[PDB]
Ligand binder design. Sequence first.
Ligand SMILES: Nc1nc2c(c(=O)[nH]1)N=C(CO)CN2
Ligand SMILES: Nc1nc2c(c(=O)[nH]1)N=C(CO)CN2
Ligand SMILES: Nc1nc2c(c(=O)[nH]1)N=C(CO)CN2
Ligand SMILES: Nc1nc2c(c(=O)[nH]1)N=C(CO)CN2
Ligand SMILES: Nc1nc2c(c(=O)[nH]1)N=C(CO)CN2
Ligand SMILES: Nc1nc2c(c(=O)[nH]1)N=C(CO)CN2
Ligand SMILES: Nc1nc2c(c(=O)[nH]1)N=C(CO)CN2
Ligand SMILES: Nc1nc2c(c(=O)[nH]1)N=C(CO)CN2
Lengths: 118, 118, 118, 118, 118, 118, 118, 118
Amino acid sequence: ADRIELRGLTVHGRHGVAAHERVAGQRFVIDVTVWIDLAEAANSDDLADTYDYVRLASRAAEIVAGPPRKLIETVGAEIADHVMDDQRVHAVEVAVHKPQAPIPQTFDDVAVVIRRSR
Amino acid sequence: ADRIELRGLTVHGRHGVYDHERVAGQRFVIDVTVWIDLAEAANSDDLADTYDYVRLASRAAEIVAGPPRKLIETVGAEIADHVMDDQRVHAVEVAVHKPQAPIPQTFDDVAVVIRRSR
Amino acid sequence: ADRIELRGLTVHGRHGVYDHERVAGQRFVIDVTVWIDLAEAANSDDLADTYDYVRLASRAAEIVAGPPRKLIETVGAEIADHVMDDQRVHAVEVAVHKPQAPIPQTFDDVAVVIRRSR
Amino acid sequence: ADRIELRGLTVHGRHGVYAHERVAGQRFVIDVTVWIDLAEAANSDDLADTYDYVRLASRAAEIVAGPPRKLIETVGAEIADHVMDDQRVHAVEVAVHKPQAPIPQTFDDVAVVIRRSR
Amino acid sequence: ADRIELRGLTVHGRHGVYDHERVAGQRFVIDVTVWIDLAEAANSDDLADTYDYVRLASRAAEIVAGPPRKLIETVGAEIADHVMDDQRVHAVEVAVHKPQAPIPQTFDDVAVVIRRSR
Amino acid sequence: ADRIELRGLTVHGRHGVYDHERVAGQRFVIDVTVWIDLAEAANSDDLADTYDYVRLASRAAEIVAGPPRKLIETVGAEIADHVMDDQRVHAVEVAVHKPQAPIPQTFDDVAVVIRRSR
Amino acid sequence: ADRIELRGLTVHGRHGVYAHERVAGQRFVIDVTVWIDLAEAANSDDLADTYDYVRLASRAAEIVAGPPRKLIETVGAEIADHVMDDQRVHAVEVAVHKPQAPIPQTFDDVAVVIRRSR
Amino acid sequence: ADRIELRGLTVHGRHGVYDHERVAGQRFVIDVTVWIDLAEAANSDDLADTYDYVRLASRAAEIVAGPPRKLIETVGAEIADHVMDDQRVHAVEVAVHKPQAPIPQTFDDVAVVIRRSR
Ligand SMILES: Nc1nc2c(c(=O)[nH]1)N=C(CO)CN2
Ligand SMILES: Nc1nc2c(c(=O)[nH]1)N=C(CO)CN2
Ligand SMILES: Nc1nc2c(c(=O)[nH]1)N=C(CO)CN2
Ligand SMILES: Nc1nc2c(c(=O)[nH]1)N=C(CO)CN2
Ligand SMILES: Nc1nc2c(c(=O)[nH]1)N=C(CO)CN2
Ligand SMILES: Nc1nc2c(c(=O)[nH]1)N=C(CO)CN2
Ligand SMILES: Nc1nc2c(c(=O)[nH]1)N=C(CO)CN2
Ligand SMILES: Nc1nc2c(c(=O)[nH]1)N=C(CO)CN2
């Protein structure tokens, strides 16, 4: 079950179904899990044989801070689709958290998890 | 494995087997995981193509805040059955936590998890 | 230095300087520290000899949930003045936290602390 | 996936392979997950229709606090087999944690998970 | 400022003003801070020249677990007066926390801090 | 004791004595505490009568993100001097934390606090 | 689903693809999960019939503090292969976390998980 | 109030009054607070003008990991005396935490705090 896991990537963005929400924006938190065979990379100790976590983080942050979407579903899909551009990846899961969602209730977190797989 | 995840929804309520528990009630904490295909919603960026987290939290809180049940089994079944009314939903899991359960032992949490699926 | 400490009182409200902050509102988190002599309540074991935390928490919640102010300073001052109406209180400090304040930076918390004394 | 989850049951105990660990004991932390069908309990709202968490916690704590064993494996098996005496139980997992394991390394936790099932 | 600090001492008890709080009781969390000069003990490395935390924790646990008081004020004063029976002590602060207090608001903690000193 | 408290402002920077620290930089965490009279602000409910947290966070972040210093002391002084620019301010304390400091020991945090007063 | 779990093993090391990273090194955090049948060990209460956690943690820490590798992939592979040396083991997963990875984004953790099995 | 704060320095050691505590040892956790004027440092940006945190953590660790004392008071005084050897230091507080202290109550932390000044 070889995988790469990025957790708690924290980025200010402006996604939200309502206009009032894109005025100032809010905190988004991203998790990404990438399923990919890692044995070649442990054998070569060559970055080229694995998925560079650094570029994973950068691309996810750029997407979150980029053009606003109404749904976090759409954000999550764009990140997941980007990951799947690497044909070595068996599957990805992208969690888009909105811990500051303007909800009159008291809760810790709300998120969507987008899965892609081949 | 697309899903929506609500975590730590915190609502005061009156559930419990013994009478003394429904004098002042206590803190309940609710998690809901909804398995649903979110591909269209990411395609459309339209709220109507997904399950609105806002109403997921509202309804969960209403039920917890509502008529008292003896068991937390009952509460989670009523939230889960509500979520399954949306025929887009493949399955649901509702965790009802009772972290202030009056037991003399020391413990972080106790909960039931009710699972429903097609 | 005898005192009563309420920590983490969490209430949804609409305080804020600009109009966007008021549409949906956000989570406010309140602390109250009440300096009062507690020797007599220890000797009588009688609630009227101390400051009842029960009414403290509900009145604080009422003020925070209520009509919005522009500044959290003035929310804090309303809670502090309420606590000072009790002649037994030597001093009080009210922390009004805005941990979801809509600013672009990544930060854990922002708050004001209002102090009153006789 | 219907289940009951007890988390963080904290009990002083005296298990350990070495004599030094029987002298004063240490903190043990227990998790129990019980897979059981809860639909009838949700339908009757009758505690007899479910596994009572109160007695789950009490018997788990009695065993942890009980006769010392060398291995946490043994402790976890005794708790799991106890839970399985309830024929409605499909399976159980008991995790016995020894967070204070006297090892020179720095670490958050060490534990065993014992699984029983039919 | 030399001091001994005990934090998070967790004890089940049955304190409280109203009848319902005593059927089952609830979790109490105690902190103690003891101001005492520690230079002698550093000089001798002899437990007799300091305040033994071991007796501090069992005696404070004993008091909390003991016959119920109506107020947590009264519990903290018995613990503080116990510590002050050691003439070496300059002062003490006892925080009695009632994190599961049966009030309808959502809050992290409520506590009283009893101070005594010569 | 009226004050404004900003906690955990998190900013990547390159501060550090030696050259290796400057290649990639590391996470810095800033707290600011501003002692200022808030009574007029509560009476007017007018942002001009207080110290705006928004400008405080953005400026503090700019300073931490900017050209590196050798010492976190100097970063802290630069933030404290900025705040003291406001003649209404009685005093300020700035904490600059370096929780990822590249030292071989295992530890939670290392920081400097800088105070200024008038 | 009998298993042994080690969590949060914290060890300073010098893995990294760039030279600047091996100059002073950084904190790594390791998790190990060992699937193995534990019924025999519960039967006998004899350490020889299970996998000793103590040498699990030792060997893992030695490997992490050992010869630096470019990739954390390689570190996990080495620990995983060591575990599989015991013919009783059905499978293992080793999580190698780099929570202080020098990337300019703000995130909680990044890790790789290596699995070996039958 | 200018100061340097080190928090959570974690070191295995063998301190303890009773014989059993010395066979395997246990985790100790140290905090140090150093009061020292930091203005000159901020002026020169030169490490020589301040108290170097990395030698502070190295020497504190060595002390904790060295030959055992009976009391944590004497460990803390040894660290404090070392810090006062720098004649620029005004005052120091050292907290020695024994979070795994082998008492039978359930608690989060026990510690002593040693202060020294001029
Ligand atoms: N699943 C889901 N629900 C929502 C979403 C969201 O992006 N996805 N956004 C909303 C308000 O911003 C309200 N509700
Ligand atoms: N499974 C389970 N056990 C119980 C329950 C509960 O709802 N579910 N409630 C009780 C106390 O009110 C006692 N124990
Ligand atoms: N000190 C202070 N600063 C602020 C305040 C406020 O309440 N207090 N509110 C703002 C926007 O709602 C912006 N700035
Ligand atoms: N798996 C396993 N390993 C151990 C155990 C134990 O209980 N189980 N206890 C030990 C010291 O008591 C040493 N190592
Ligand atoms: N200060 C304070 N307030 C209270 C107390 C208490 O112990 N102290 N107990 C209550 C009911 O148990 C209600 N309110
Ligand atoms: N007080 C203090 N000590 C140090 C400093 C510093 O910023 N302040 N930075 C160093 C390495 O970057 C090491 N030592
Ligand atoms: N998957 C993965 N990605 C990386 C790694 C690494 O160890 N594994 N190390 C890095 C720089 O040291 C950059 N990128
Ligand atoms: N204050 C104090 N009390 C204790 C001490 C200790 O070091 N200091 N250690 C003990 C056994 O190690 C028991 N009690």
